Amino acid sequence: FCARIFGPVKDYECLCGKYKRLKHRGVICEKCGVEVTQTKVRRERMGHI
RNA sequence: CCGGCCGGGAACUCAAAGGAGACUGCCAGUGAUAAACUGGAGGAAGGUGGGGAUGACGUCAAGUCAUCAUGGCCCUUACGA
């Protein structure tokens, strides 16, 4: 359950909360890559190991 | 009569040089995907592998007029020889 590994906890919502803007799209949390997109797409977030 | 004493040989020890090479090249952990540090294999040498030389503008009106030279000062029957 990560935003850097997968995605926004909420629609255009950063892990830390640096982006509580549902206008912010693409720009990541510079600490850890959180590309803001709709959290609903996390029903299709494919990762690996 | 083996202190290689007499032949013989050109790969090596050694030496004068043209160059390869070690640069964080690879894997992993830690870590803000950067950098970096540690361990190991690899490797002749490992994390600038070691040392010398190289001493940034400047500090100290510190040394030399006793290598020497010098704007001047003194001596020139002299301290010059």
Side-chain angles (χ1 to χ4, degrees), chain A residues 1-20:
Chain A
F1 303 117
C2 184
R4 182 276 184 63
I5 298 178
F6 293 117
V9 184
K10 195 184 68 179
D11 297 305
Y12 312 123
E13 183 65 60
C14 185
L15 192 297
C16 58
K18 190 178 182 176
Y19 307 114
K20 301 183 174 63

Side-chain angles (χ1 to χ4, degrees), chain A residues 21-35:
Chain A
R21 193 99 302 297
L22 295 81
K23 184 190 67 172
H24 287 175
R25 296 184 270 287
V27 67
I28 61 168
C29 178
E30 280 58 59
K31 282 73 177 182
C32 291
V34 179
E35 54 178 55

